[PDB]
Every structure is written in C-alpha cells, then in structure tokens.
Enzyme design. Structure first.
Site, short mmCIF file in Angstrom:
data_model
loop_
_atom_site.label_atom_id
_atom_site.label_comp_id
_atom_site.label_asym_id
_atom_site.label_seq_id
_atom_site.Cartn_x
_atom_site.Cartn_y
_atom_site.Cartn_z
N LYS A 1 0.55 -1.00 2.17
CA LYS A 1 1.03 -1.47 0.87
C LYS A 1 -0.19 -1.57 -0.03
O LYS A 1 -1.32 -1.56 0.46
CB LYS A 1 1.73 -2.84 0.98
CG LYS A 1 0.93 -3.91 1.74
CD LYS A 1 1.77 -5.18 1.97
CE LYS A 1 2.87 -4.96 3.01
NZ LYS A 1 4.19 -5.39 2.48
N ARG A 2 0.02 -1.66 -1.34
CA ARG A 2 -1.10 -1.81 -2.27
C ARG A 2 -1.94 -3.05 -1.93
O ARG A 2 -1.41 -4.04 -1.42
CB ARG A 2 -0.60 -1.86 -3.72
CG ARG A 2 -0.03 -0.53 -4.24
CD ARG A 2 -1.12 0.53 -4.45
NE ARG A 2 -2.07 0.13 -5.49
CZ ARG A 2 -2.06 0.59 -6.74
NH1 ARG A 2 -1.17 1.49 -7.13
NH2 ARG A 2 -2.97 0.15 -7.61
N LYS B 1 -0.51 -10.34 -1.16
CA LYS B 1 -0.01 -9.66 0.04
C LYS B 1 -0.80 -10.05 1.30
O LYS B 1 -0.38 -9.77 2.42
CB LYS B 1 -0.01 -8.14 -0.16
CG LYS B 1 1.05 -7.66 -1.16
CD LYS B 1 0.84 -6.19 -1.50
CE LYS B 1 1.79 -5.69 -2.58
NZ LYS B 1 3.21 -5.54 -2.10
N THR C 1 9.89 -3.44 0.01
CA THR C 1 10.76 -2.36 0.47
C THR C 1 10.16 -1.65 1.68
O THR C 1 10.89 -1.06 2.49
CB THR C 1 11.05 -1.32 -0.62
OG1 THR C 1 9.81 -0.87 -1.18
CG2 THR C 1 11.94 -1.91 -1.72
N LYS D 1 11.81 -0.15 5.41
CA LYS D 1 11.48 1.14 6.01
C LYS D 1 11.09 0.98 7.48
O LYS D 1 11.49 1.78 8.33
CB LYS D 1 10.35 1.85 5.25
CG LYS D 1 10.59 2.04 3.76
CD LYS D 1 9.34 2.55 3.04
CE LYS D 1 9.46 2.37 1.53
NZ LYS D 1 8.18 2.72 0.83
O1 LIG Z 1 5.60 -2.26 -7.75
C1 LIG Z 1 5.67 -3.26 -8.47
N1 LIG Z 1 5.04 -3.34 -9.65
C2 LIG Z 1 4.28 -2.36 -10.17
O2 LIG Z 1 4.06 -1.27 -9.63
C3 LIG Z 1 3.65 -2.67 -11.53
C4 LIG Z 1 2.78 -1.70 -12.31
C5 LIG Z 1 2.51 -2.54 -13.54
C6 LIG Z 1 1.78 -2.28 -14.71
C7 LIG Z 1 1.68 -3.26 -15.69
C8 LIG Z 1 2.30 -4.49 -15.52
C9 LIG Z 1 3.03 -4.75 -14.36
C10 LIG Z 1 3.14 -3.78 -13.36
N2 LIG Z 1 3.78 -3.82 -12.18
N3 LIG Z 1 6.40 -4.33 -8.11
C11 LIG Z 1 7.16 -4.35 -6.83
O3 LIG Z 1 8.52 -3.92 -7.10
C12 LIG Z 1 9.27 -3.70 -5.87
C13 LIG Z 1 10.64 -3.10 -6.25
O4 LIG Z 1 11.51 -4.13 -6.73
C14 LIG Z 1 9.38 -5.01 -5.05
O5 LIG Z 1 9.95 -4.73 -3.76
C15 LIG Z 1 8.01 -5.70 -4.88
O6 LIG Z 1 8.21 -7.01 -4.36
C16 LIG Z 1 7.23 -5.75 -6.21
O7 LIG Z 1 5.91 -6.27 -6.03
C1 LIG Z 2 7.71 1.68 0.14
C2 LIG Z 2 6.33 1.96 -0.42
C3 LIG Z 2 5.62 0.94 -1.07
C4 LIG Z 2 6.16 -0.45 -1.19
O1 LIG Z 2 5.74 -1.27 -0.08
P1 LIG Z 2 5.75 -2.88 -0.07
O2 LIG Z 2 5.22 -3.10 1.30
O3 LIG Z 2 7.17 -3.26 -0.21
O4 LIG Z 2 4.86 -3.28 -1.17
C5 LIG Z 2 4.34 1.17 -1.57
N1 LIG Z 2 3.78 2.42 -1.47
C6 LIG Z 2 4.47 3.45 -0.84
C7 LIG Z 2 3.85 4.80 -0.74
C8 LIG Z 2 5.75 3.23 -0.32
O5 LIG Z 2 6.33 4.18 0.23
#
Ligand SMILES: O=C(NC(=O)c1cc2ccccc2[nH]1)N[C@@H]1O[C@H](CO)[C@@H](O)[C@H](O)[C@H]1O
Ligand SMILES: *Cc1c(COP(=O)(O)O)cnc(C)c1O
Ligand SMILES: O=C(NC(=O)c1cc2ccccc2[nH]1)N[C@@H]1O[C@H](CO)[C@@H](O)[C@H](O)[C@H]1O
Ligand SMILES: O=C(NC(=O)c1cc2ccccc2[nH]1)N[C@@H]1O[C@H](CO)[C@@H](O)[C@H](O)[C@H]1O
Ligand SMILES: O=C(NC(=O)c1cc2ccccc2[nH]1)N[C@@H]1O[C@H](CO)[C@@H](O)[C@H](O)[C@H]1O
Ligand SMILES: *Cc1c(COP(=O)(O)O)cnc(C)c1O
Lengths: 810, 810
Positions: A542-543, A548, A650, A654
């Site tokens: 994950k990122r 996290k 998510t 998976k």
């Molecule tokens: O992935 C998420 N957010 C971003 O990528 C994001 C880019 C960005 C740029 C500017 C301001 C805000 C920003 N945010 N949130 C995830 O979104 C997922 C899908 O709902 C969740 O499963 C997860 O919990 C949540 O962390």
């Molecule tokens: C599913 C997925 C994520 C989201 O993972 P989380 O553990 O829910 O943050 C991030 N990056 C990739 C490439 C994914 O496939």
C-alpha cells in the site's frame, strides 16, 4: 487448459492465428524474421481489440435507442493497470488466444508482461474508480468514466542505496492500442478573464481558451456483450495561441501542460495552480459533453431523471458551480430551478477524514482563474447559511463552522462543504467511516440534512482480483460450485460446506503453494533476490503513510530479529516479510520509512545466525500489475492502520479473496470483513476507535510505553545508536523523535497487542490443516466485498437505476 | 474514366470496397450512420496504405541481400504535400479506387481535399528533396531521405486587412496514416559537456542526452514495386531527465522542443541556438543509423564504396565533423584515413549565392554546444590552409579568404567552406548558377580543386507535376505517344510532329480551358472571389523575396491600370493577375509587398471603368496542394528574378510542363529552358548577368530611370501620395525609399523592357492558334527538366551508382 478460461474452438483458434498474422504484417509492418516479443504483444493486442468493436458500437447505439438514465463517474484518477488479459477474460477469449499463440510458437504469459500499466492513479481511490467501471459494465448500466489522459502517470519507483528515486512513467512511449482518439469531439475550456454584469445577467469575457480532446477506451462487461466507455481528456492549444513566431509556437506547451502529469501527493493537499487547472479542465469539458448528449435525446426539469453525476472525492467539485454557471448564465434558468436540478444531479463520495488531505482552495487563486465560479460559490454560501440560520436560530458558531468560506490569514473555500451543500447524497466508503462522518467532521451537516448521508461499503472486482490474477483458485472453486460466482460473488458461501472436505483442503493449500513458488521465481529472475518458499509470506503493500503504520510492522520485524539473536537455537516459524509501496515525493517521513525498511533488511538478510528463518524484502515499484502477482502469493495480510484513519481499504479485500489471513485493527472495512468471516477467523488486535478517543482526552505520552516495555526500549536504543546505520549513526533521528514526541498515530500504544497477536499467527501456521480451514472460512465469506454489490447499492440508493445481468446480442 | 489512371478490374474494385468497410469499422470505430467525410478519407488512406506493405518489406529485404551502395539524402526540409493521390498514381490504383468509392456513394476528389499537406519545408529546396525521393525510388536506387519530423511545419497564412498573419500548422492533429513510428530504433544524441584529453585520445564527457525516435514514411516508385524510406527523427527526453518533481516532468518540454517547429526564415540566416540543435540532432542520429547499417552488412576502407551522403545545402554540414568524430574518437582510426573516408563519402549542393543566406555560426555557440566538433573544425582548417599555402606560396590574402574561420567582432565558422573542404563533389543547381560559383564566391576553391566542381540542373517529378495535377493533359499526350513518357520525359519531343495537327491544337487548348474553369470555381466556392475565365491567367507564385521581384510585377499591374484609365474605351487583352506566396515572419519588406499587392487589388477590382478587363488577386496560403491547382490553370508564368540571383527555380519547370508560356529573365534554369524550347518560344527580357555587373561597376542610380520614364514617375507619385492607401497616405514610404535609394535588385532597370515584353505577350494571346502552337513547342521540350534526368546524373557523376527501371516482383 482450465475451464474458467473458456473454450478453444477449432474455428476460433484458426481465425485468431490469421488475424494475428494480418496485424503483424499490415499494422506493425514486420515479418517473423525481424519481429521482437514487443511486436508480438502488439499483434495480439490488435487481434483482441478487433473483437471489442462490434459490441462497442452496438452498446452505444442501444443506449441511444432506449435512452436510459446515464451515469457519469467523474474522477481525477483511474488506476487501470494492464488491459490485454482483462479484455480476454471478459470476452471469454483467454484459452483460445493461449492456444492460438502456442501454435504460433509463442508464450502468451510472456507477451502479457510487455504491456505497460495505465497508472493514472495513486492508489485506493484511483483503483476504486477502475473496479467500479468494470462492475457498471457487468451490471448493464449506461455508465461513462470521465477523467484526464495524463501523459505521465504515477512515477516509476527505483530504490538506490535504500532510498526512493522517482522516474517519469512514460507509459505512452510505444503507443496505446486500447484508446481511440476522437479529435472531432474537441471542446473549448475557458480560464482567467473577467465578469461583466449586463442588463441580462452576468457574462464571462476575455478568457483564455484551452482545447479538450477526448480519447475513448472500451470498458467490457463480464461476458454480457456490454462495452461502456471511459473518456479521458487531453489538453491542446488553439492554433492562434500566442499568435517572436518561434517562441509563440513553443509557448503552446504552457496550455498543453494541463494534462502532462498526475499529481503524486496523496497525503497532503497542496494548493497548486496547475492542479486547479486540471480539476476545472476535466469538469468543464465533461459537463459540455453531458449537456450535448442530453439535448440530443430545452426543458431541464428532466435533467436529473436522465443524468447522474458522481463526484469521486472533492477533486471534481467544481462540477457544482460549473453546472450552475451553464444553467443560469447560458441556458437562462432562474437560480432556484437551476439549484434544484444541480442538487438532484450530483452526489459526493468522501474517502478520508484526515484534515490535511481536505481541499481548501485559496480565494485569491479562484478569483484570478475562475472569477465567475467564485461569485457563484459566494451566492451558494449565502443561501445555504440563510437556511442554517432559519433551522438553528441564534447559533452563530454553527454559521462559521458550516460556511463554505473559511476565514483566516488567507480566505479559503472548503470544497467538502461545497459538495455537501450541492449534492442530494453524501457517502462514506465503509460503515465505520460513514458513522465517523456523521459524528465528527460533517456532524453539523448531518444535523441539518440527515437524509443526505449514506454508506456504500467499498468492493473490488472479482474478475481482475480473482479470475485474472489467481486462475488456479478460481478453477478449484469452479470445480465444486460452478462458474456463476464470478458475477455473483455471494455464491462463495457455498464453500462453507467444504471446510471439512479433505480434497478441497488439499487443493486450496496446493494453489497457495504454487502461487508462492511462482512469485519466488519472479523475484529471482527480475531482481536476483533469494527467498524460502516454505516460509510464511507476511505482506504489507500500500502507499507509504504514517497512518498506515508501516512503522509498526518495522517494530515487529526488529522484535523477531532481537528474539532470534537472544535465543538462536530455539525454533521459530520462518517468515518472509515483504513491504512495498510508493511515497509521495515531498513526504519526508515516508521516504525515511522506506530507508528504514531497506536498512533493516541489510542487517537481517546478512546475519548468519538468522539464516533462512527471517527475510525482509522491500518490493520495489508497487503497482497494479505487481499487486496481481504478490496478492495471490500472500499468507498474511497486514492491515494495521490506527483505528479511525483508514476510511475503508481495498487491498484488504483483495487478500481475503485470494486465501490470505488478515492481521488487522478494527478500522475501515476490516470491521465488516471480521463481521462476515467471524471474529474467530480474523487476527484482530489493538485500540478500537473509542480507545483512541480516550487516549486523546488524556493526552498521548509515548514515553510511558518506552519506560514500561523493555523490548520496545531496546529497539529505540538500536535505532538511535546507529545499529541499523553504522556509517551514519544519527540517520534515523527524525523517526525516533517523531515516535517519542510527535506521533499522531500512536504506534507505541498498539505495539504489545500487535506482537502478541503475531505470536498467535505463527502458532496457527504450525498447523497447516487448521490454517487452511480458516482460510476457507475467509474466502467463503468474501462475497459482500464484490464491487458488483457496491455498484448495485449506488444504482438503487443514489442513482435511481436498476442493474441488469441480461446479455446484449453478440 | 481516363487511361493513364489505370484499370478498374472487377476483382480489385470488390476487394477495395470490402477493405474500405473493414477499416471504417475496425480501424476508425464508425458506421455509415455517423461517419463524416474525414472518416471516409481515413478509411481510404488505410485501404491504400495496405497495398504498400508487402512491397515495402520486400524492397528493404532486397537491399539487405544484394547489399548495394546506399544513398543518404540529408535535408532539414522535405516539402511533401499530400500523399494519398501520389500513392495511388504510383501503384496504378487511381481508377480502381475512384470506382470503388463511387459504388459506395462517395466522391474521391472530395475525400482527397481532406488530407493535410506535409509542409515540412519552406519552398524550392524542400520541394526539390521531395521530387528527388520520388525519382530515386522510380530509378531503383537504394536511397533514404533523412530529416526532422517537425510537429509544426510551415505556418498557415491568413490575410487580414491585407496583411499576412501566421498561424501554427498543426498538421498532426488528426493523425498521420502515412508514418510508422519505430520507437525500438531510438538513438541518443549528445549536447554541451566538455572535452577530456587522455593517453588514448580525446573524450567527450558530461553531456546532456536527447533521444531521437525515428518515424518511417514509404516512398513508392512509379509502378516498379520499389518502396524506399524517408526516416524523420523526433526529439524525446530520457526518462531520468531533470530527475520539484512536477517541474522536472514539465521541463522535459525543453529537450522535446528540438523537433517542434520548422524555421520559416528562407531569406536571412539567423544564428539561433535552437536551429543549431536541430542541425546537429538530425546529423548525429542519422550518422549512427548509417554506421549501424554498414556494420550489419570493422574495415572503414570500404565505407565510401557502400555509403554516399548528400548534403542539401550547409544545413546538415555538421555531418563532416561528426563523421570525423566517430571515426577518430570512437573507431580509433588515424586522422588521415578518417579524412580520406569522409571526403569520399560526402557531397555538397549549394542553392544560393546571396551572402545573407549563408550559414556563419558564431564560434562561442559551437564552443558551448559542441566543444569537440569545434576542435575538429579547427584541425580541418589548419590542415586545409597548409595545403593552400603549399599550392599558392606567399598568397597571404588567399589564406584569410579561404579560411573556415572568419575573423571580426565575433569569430564565425563559414559552413560552406567546411562543406567544400570535406566533400569530393560540390554542385550548383543550374548551369549559370554553377558557373557563377566558380567565377565568384567559390573562385579560390575552384582554383585549388577544379575537379570537385560540378553542375546538376534541377528538375521536377512528372508524376506529381503532370499525371497527378493535370490528368487531362497527361491523357491527351498519352493518346498520341503512349504512356512511356511518364518515366522517360524526353519522349515528349515526339509531340513536335503534332504542332500543325489541328486535333491536337484543339485538345491542348480545351484542356487549359477546363483547368481554368475548375480553378475559377475553386476560387468562388472556397474564397467567394469572382474571376473571368476568358482572361489571360497571369501567375507569379513563389515565396516573397526582393530578389524574386514581385515588386516589378506590381509596377506592370499599375501601368496597365493607368493606361486603362487614360484610354478607357480602347481594347486591351483581359487579364487575371494572380500573385501568391508566404513571407518569412521577420522579413518586414516582404510583408509590405504583400500589403501592396492587396492594396492594388482593392483599387483595381472595384473600379467600374476597368470592369472585368483587369483583376488582381492575392492567392492566400500558397503551398504544394495549391500549386497543384493553380499551375495547370496558368497561361503566363512569371519568372522575373534579377539576373544572377535565382540559383535555378523549379516553379518555372512546373509551369512549362503544364502548358503555360514563360515571361522571364536569363536567370537560373530559365536559360536552359529557353535553350531547350528555342528563344523564339520564350518571352525573354531584361539585363543579363553581364549587364548587371556593368551597372554595379558604374553604380546603380534609380533616380535616372525615374527622371527619364514618365509612366514610372506616375506610379511612384501615386504610391508616395497615398493613392493606394487613402486613410494611411504614407503607408508605402518604406517601399518607395527602398526603390529610390537602396534597391539591391535593380527593379527600375528592367521596367521598360518588361512592360514592352508584356505587350508582346498580350499580342500573341489575341491569336489563340499561335499561342497554343508555342505552348506545344514548350511542353514538347520540357523533358530535360524531369528530376529523373537530374537524379540519373547525381547517380552516375557523384554517387557512383547505376539507375534501373527494372521491376521488382509484386
Ligand atoms: O486513495 C485515496 N486517496 C488518494 O489517492 C488521494 C490523492 C489526493 C490528492 C489531493 C488531495 C487528496 C488526495 N487523496 N484514498 C483512499 O480511497 C480508498 C477508496 O475509497 C479507500 O479504501 C482508502 O481508505 C482511502 O485512503
Ligand atoms: C488495491 C490497491 C491499493 C489500495 O490498497 P490499500 O491497502 O487499501 O490502501 C493501492 N495500490 C494498488 C496498486 C492497489 O492495487
Ligand atoms: O500500428 C501502427 N501502425 C502504423 O502507424 C502504420 C502501419 C503502416 C503501413 C504502411 C505505411 C504507414 C503505416 N503506419 N501504428 C500505431 O497504432 C497504435 C494503436 O492504435 C497507436 O497507439 C500508435 O501511436 C501508432 O504508432
Ligand atoms: O485509427 C486508429 N484507431 C485506433 O487508434 C483504435 C481503433 C480501436 C478499436 C477499439 C479499441 C481501441 C481502438 N483504437 N488510430 C489512429 O491511427 C493513425 C494511423 O496509424 C495514427 O496516426 C493516429 O495517431 C491514431 O489515432
Ligand atoms: O529554397 C531555398 N532555400 C531555402 O528554403 C532556405 C531555408 C533557409 C534557412 C536558413 C538559411 C538558408 C535557407 N535557405 N532555395 C531554393 O532552392 C531551389 C532548389 O535548388 C532553387 O531552385 C532556388 O533557386 C533556391 O532559391
Ligand atoms: C515548386 C514550389 C516552390 C518553388 O518555386 P520557385 O518559383 O522555383 O521559387 C515553392 N513553393 C511551392 C509550394 C512549390 O511547389
């Protein structure tokens, strides 16, 4: 070879072979003597692509004849990954293409590895959009994904001396066979200028123009002959732009920079002008496209009956004032009517409660770039606050809390407040998250308009995340319960009657072992790293973010290492600990965490006393294609965010679908996953949301944990003294300082429960039969987490449309 | 319909129709319900393109097996125009496609008008390269054109208020079906850095890298199944370029700007850094490609036996020091051997004697951008000057005259001197021009190495410039003498026995009338301008330059107008005077000339007394596709440069081939055209080169002509007083001042002879039969001016290869 991959009919195989040869010749201008693997990939892509065309044309003409309500999913991110295998899966062409290529002397799996990921997203939010497109097509909805065609997606990550390096993701270098440019449908987008007030309303004049050129990508449904469209906009300068001469032509780059690159900062909102331009660019072009399609079916009363706009976070929030602008300034509707139409059309999905991630645009930026939109926002705010005042008379502080305009040093517009005011539905992405929204950050809004607030628990597509990435598991499931579960994941519940089935237990364990062997081979061939396939595969991908808590995982790793060093001749369950993910380029702490992980590996992986009992590997360049490889191989899924911080997750879903057990906090969708599987089949540890709240009221003192836990003290002393960085003794001082004095996410508070829980994981892994039985109980109850379920709920409860599994004629 | 356009066989037509429908569906993703004319063009282009593939692959494999000497034509300009009709002509597909499209309910001529010109050149030099590619393929030579894929070609010209406006030529907007990207053959090009001297020679280090990605375009020969390649390089940033993060990705534009735009200044050399980068870019990428192909056939003694490099002017002159650099620094050859190979490989073609057009690069620019090349240039110069000193002992002034390095305020490198020193052959482009080179600007070099200096009179391809643009004339010729003349233009001499043939006289005049009617209809439909089709079509089309003397034409136009006003009721032969051409954006005088032409039209075209007896039209956006329309319609070709200034001209040859008579000076190829046709069949006027020289020795005094010619005085008074600009009385003061005091090109000196000669043109036009007979004598003797003749001479006298009209198997 395997049943779920379809039929390899003699006629189909013959036709695929000849079309492959036709494309290699006419399309690629090559012959078999000079062609490379890349050429062969492209010939196959073109061959498969041809099968989409008829279905794509007939799906779109079907929507024109039946004129159903259209769903527009607006997102700045679409994290698509590779397209070749997914297209074959959804068209039932996989086995036929495998046979066709085999008869031509080619390995299809080798060709699949040539395709670049379409990495037009950062992580969860972008991947959700992608799974949603797949589900909407599978459920026969008239749906369109709208976004930006970034020339450069999320950067490729290189690890150099243990540090993250970023390089441009030049994903279009060799061409993209999956897109169709549509230059004929190019639309103008306006920027800057000024507002003129005439006898007949406001006029936005003296603007600069950037063109939006659409590229269309097909989105095939699962074996239903439905092919929907993802339309991505690319920025183009008008031909009279800046029109000494040479410089004017070169300056066209400035306009075209709008669609150049994806912003990689997923941790911290940065109020950058170029990002604001991207957000308006997608909104303005998309809304013109929507209105044109609506008119080609005068009366906008029926607009919300024919159009739904879903906002993926606040990133496309300018849709609200842009729609008002078009309806009021151009179509000449009265304000109240336009507002009614707007609210009934728009819906907003929130993805985080962390304050630093929320979009708060400086007023001065909007004043310069979008002067008419600011005026519209001010009017929305005044009318909204007049409603708040009428509902809660005398509550002056509520008025300042709920305002779209935030006062301070610089005035800002709260885009979330704008979204709530202008949408008929607001949703969180997991039950706990949706409850947190109503109790905390949006409490005032919930009190005013309770009917607006909903939950839509996230999901993943079982096509990409089971059939595509784990065909071995899909097949052994199909042998018992048939193929219907692929588009009806709730059918996996039938596997519960196989929990004591000796053959099924063996088959599930065998599939996992095969996946682990394959991934171990992938690591040696592409990276020259050696791992023990018999070890427990402990995975956190994950990122990289503080919330996290990759750092908590790091502490456990060091704990295990220290315990081995203290008692070398005692048996421990062998582990391969894998951590992967990208850090936002300007996120210093996240970059330090990556360096720490690699530094731990450098010590652990070369200690002779440890041997093959513990290995720590950083998985470089984590992305969709890598997720498809590592997730099927995983034994343990690390989902260890501080309770109340991960909106859903998510990746967790998976892993559940692919036969890993989960160690996790009661955060996001983990709660519902444990509810579905049973708490006895989940490794749950740590503070609940309520426990975090109690600690905050008291004040979090990390020193307390340091003083009372000797094993934790040892680790901190090792980090501070330079045990993991002998040549740079104070390298990790920033990490230690943060943990001891400024830890927002309470890493030390969950340490003891985490280590104890990890001991119970190791205990169960010693019993292969009982491990596998618990795995079966997880896979069997993963059905709720299909994005088909999620989309059906959006359709019924927000968009007002009914899904359908009925086939279109082929 | 007509014989020269080929057969429309039942089987071919059926196959073309089905492939058209296949491309409309699978390639364009359209059906007949939503398809536009543009979609239909693209379907046809793809259909025709498919026919090139087999021939293209088999031509290139044929060169690999036979391993003939390869010809590399290096040019910064390739003025290609449209490709669809030319491809059909050369493949004998025109009638079949016409029938196929007709049966589908489409007009092929309408579809042809949709294609954008590939305008990758300024005029003559760029168009010569294009005709040469066509001829080299027709003559079966293993030839490759190498250049730059400009994103923007020569600007589109708009006329606004009588002034030229420039807009970007976004020719790639809808895609280019004729190119095949070859990203796999991408090569690095190096810039800046520094030279390090080691024990084993010089090393060029610390450079910045730009990638060169090739795009290949097929060049089909005339019905011989030969398909050669034009390879154009596009600039690409490396993926680690500048690798805060966002800015680094955006900064990739700086490297990629190298191939962004064609420099439109064809009048005056400007020492701009970006232009120097373009010149090295094409040279470095091309030479790597050449050497790779040579090695894939260690010993460079055979290099000149297998490789010929032709330099189209000095623009690719860096090939000489670059080849030396590779041979000496990388292949480790001794200097003398490398130099021998270089000289025997390279040849140089000069295109002008005007001093301001000659490339003289500041030393400081080369020092910074290309430090190793400067060192190599210095060494070449020293060794060359040592030879001059040995041949002409004590002649110190000759040494400074012949030096590659020019002293002064800023030191410069004379690129022409570099080219002569480093080439085994130097040629001018018409007999008079080649003689002028030996007597004037290169006199010293001719005295040292007389064997190097050659003539190669220019030519045009009779495929594009007769069969394609004037099928009616091609057909009436074919009816009498067969089809062989299309690839053997000398056969046109057979038409001399038809000069008294009553049927042929009528047919030639009829074809001209039809062409004139068609062009008159083109002007009304696309521009809403009305012309009399019975008038003499008096045409001057070419880039706007003082040396080309559009101003002299203007003076004649005003003379005719004034004579009509003086004697309104006297009969004059009706004329439509058409002038067209682009001005370089920074060329003030040329822009003023355009304004003058339109200003004259504004007065003349609206004078009731004039009526339809005189019309003056400026032809907007003159380009290859427009030349193909106007040249067949022309009665009189204006070729009126000051004697000694137009190196050759090629427009002159196009007009001769298409049945126009020529009014011209004895300049460039006009001399040889008059020699071929007979002086009695040409309207020759004005000073010869010798007369210009005499006037220069005496001193040119324009006042003398003003004082002695009353009709000239009237015109100057009208211009100065504001007769052609009533609201801006002094608008043309710059033009008057130049003509009176600073005229390098002696406009007044040829005025009287020009007007008198024009009277003789009008006299002959009154006698349609005798006009047409003289036309026949011109067409019949135009054979020498086929570019097939030109290329055969280059092949035999410079490259050391034999041409062939033999067919490759289809
Ligand atoms: O992935 C998420 N957010 C971003 O990528 C994001 C880019 C960005 C740029 C500017 C301001 C805000 C920003 N945010 N949130 C995830 O979104 C997922 C899908 O709902 C969740 O499963 C997860 O919990 C949540 O962390
Ligand atoms: C599913 C997925 C994520 C989201 O993972 P989380 O553990 O829910 O943050 C991030 N990056 C990739 C490439 C994914 O496939
Ligand atoms: O596959 C491609 N073929 C050609 O461009 C081409 C074949 C050919 C034959 C004769 C003469 C010219 C010719 N040209 N182009 C790719 O087609 C891809 C898929 O659409 C694009 O993404 C990509 O940009 C483009 O390079
Ligand atoms: O003709 C083209 N077709 C496609 O790109 C395409 C068809 C299709 C069907 C299903 C799914 C995706 C699909 N994509 N592309 C053009 O091909 C031209 C000729 O090679 C290029 O110049 C031009 O850049 C390119 O746009
Ligand atoms: O077309 C010509 N030259 C150029 O286009 C040109 C661009 C440029 C840029 C920088 C420096 C110099 C430059 N020059 N020369 C023509 O070349 C034709 C082909 O030989 C001749 O017929 C004709 O006489 C001659 O004028
Ligand atoms: C042939 C041609 C030229 C060259 O014409 P000259 O009269 O020889 O200068 C210039 N532009 C175009 C478009 C041409 O076709």
């Amino acid at each position: 070879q395997i049943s779920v991959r379809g039929l390899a009919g003699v006629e189909n195989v013959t036709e695929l072979k000849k079309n492959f040869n036709r494309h290699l010749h006419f399309t690629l201008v090559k012959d078999r003597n000079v062609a490379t693997p890349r050429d062969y990939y492209f010939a196959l892509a073109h061959t498969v692509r041809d099968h989409l065309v008829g279905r794509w044309i007939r799906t779109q003409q079907h929507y024109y004849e039946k004129d159903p309500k259209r769903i527009y999913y607006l997102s700045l991110e679409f994290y698509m990954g590779r397209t070749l295998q997914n297209t074959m899966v959804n068209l039932a062409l996989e086995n036929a293409c495998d046979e066709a290529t085999y008869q031509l002397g080619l390995d299809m799996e080798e060709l699949e590895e040539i395709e670049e990921d379409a990495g037009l997203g950062n992580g969860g939010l972008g991947r959700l959009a992608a799974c949603f497109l797949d589900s909407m097509a599978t459920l026969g909805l008239a749906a369109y994904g709208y976004g930006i065609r970034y020339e450069f997606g999320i950067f490729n990550q290189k690890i150099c001396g243990g540090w993250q390096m970023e390089e441009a993701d030049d994903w279009l270098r060799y061409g993209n066979p999956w897109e169709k440019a549509r230059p004929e449908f190019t639309l103008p987008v306006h920027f800057y200028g000024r507002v003129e007030h005439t006898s007949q309303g406001a006029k936005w004049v003296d603007t600069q123009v950037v063109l939006a050129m659409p590229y269309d990508t097909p989105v095939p449904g699962y074996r239903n002959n439905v092919v929907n469209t993802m339309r991505l906009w690319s920025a183009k300068a008008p031909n009279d732009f800046n029109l000494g001469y040479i410089q004017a032509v070169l300056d066209r780059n400035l306009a075209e920079n709008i669609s150049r690159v994806l912003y990689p900062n997923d941790n911290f909102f940065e109020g950058k002008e170029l990002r604001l331009k991207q957000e308006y660019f997608v909104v303005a072009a998309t809304l013109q496209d929507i209105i044109r399609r609506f008119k080609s079916s005068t009366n906008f009363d029926a607009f919300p009956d024919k159009v739904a706009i879903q906002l993926n976070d606040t990133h496309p929030s300018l849709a609200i004032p842009e729609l008002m602008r078009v309806l009021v300034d151009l179509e000449r509707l009265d304000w109240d009517k336009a507002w009614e139409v707007t609210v009934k059309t728009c819906a907003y999905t929130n993805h985080t409660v962390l304050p630093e991630a929320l979009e708060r645009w400086p007023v001065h930026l909007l004043e310069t770039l979008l002067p008419r939109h600011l005026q519209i926002i001010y009017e929305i705010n005044q009318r909204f606050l007049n409603r708040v005042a009428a509902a809660f008379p005398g509550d002056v502080d509520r008025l300042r809390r709920m305002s779209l305009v935030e006062e301070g040093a610089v005035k800002r517009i709260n885009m979330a407040h704008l979204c709530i005011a202008g949408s008929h539905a607001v949703n969180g992405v997991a039950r706990i998250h949706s409850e947190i929204l109503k109790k905390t950050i949006f409490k005032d809004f919930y009190e005013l308009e309770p009917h607006k607030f909903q939950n839509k628990t996230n999901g993943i597509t079982p096509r990409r995340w089971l059939v595509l990435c784990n065909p071995g598991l899909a097949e052994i499931i199909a042998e018992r319960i048939g193929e219907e579960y692929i588009s009806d994941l709730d059918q996996l519940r039938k596997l519960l009657s196989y929990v004591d089935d000796e053959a099924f237990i063996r088959d599930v364990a065998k599939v996992k072992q095969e996946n682990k062997l394959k991934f171990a081979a992938y690591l040696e061939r592409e990276y020259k790293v050696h791992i023990n396939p018999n070890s427990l595969f402990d995975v956190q991908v994950k990122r990289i973010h503080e919330y996290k808590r990759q750092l908590l995982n790091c502490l456990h790793v060091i704990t295990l290492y220290n315990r081995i060093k203290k008692e070398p001749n005692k048996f421990v369950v062998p582990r391969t600990v894998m951590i992967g993910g990208k850090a936002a380029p300007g996120y210093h702490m996240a970059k330090m965490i990556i360096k720490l992980i690699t530094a731990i590996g450098d010590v652990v992986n070369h200690d002779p006393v440890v041997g093959d009992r513990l290995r720590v590997i950083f998985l470089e360049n984590y992305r969709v294609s890598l997720a498809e490889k590592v997730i099927p191989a995983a034994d343990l899924s690390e989902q260890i965010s501080t309770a109340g911080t991960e909106a859903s997750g998510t990746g967790n879903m998976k892993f559940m679908l692919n036969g890993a057990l989960t160690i996790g906090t009661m955060d996001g969708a983990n709660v519902e996953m444990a509810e579905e599987a049973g708490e006895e089949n989940f490794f749950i540890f740590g503070m609940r949301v309520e426990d975090v709240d109690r600690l905050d009221q008291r004040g979090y003192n990390a020193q307390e944990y340091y003083d009372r836990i000797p094993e934790l003290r040892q680790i901190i002393e090792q980090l501070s003294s330079g045990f993991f960085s002998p040549k740079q003794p104070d390298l990790f001082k920033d990490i230690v300082n943060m943990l001891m004095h400024h830890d927002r996410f309470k890493v030390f508070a969950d340490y003891e429960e985490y280590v104890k829980c990890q001991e119970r994981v190791s205990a169960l892994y010693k019993n292969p039969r009982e491990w596998t039985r618990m795995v079966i109980r997880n896979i069997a109850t993963s059905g709720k987490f299909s994005s088909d379920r999620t989309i059906a709920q959006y359709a019924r409860e927000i968009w007002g449309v009914e899904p359908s599994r009925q086939r279109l004629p082929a």
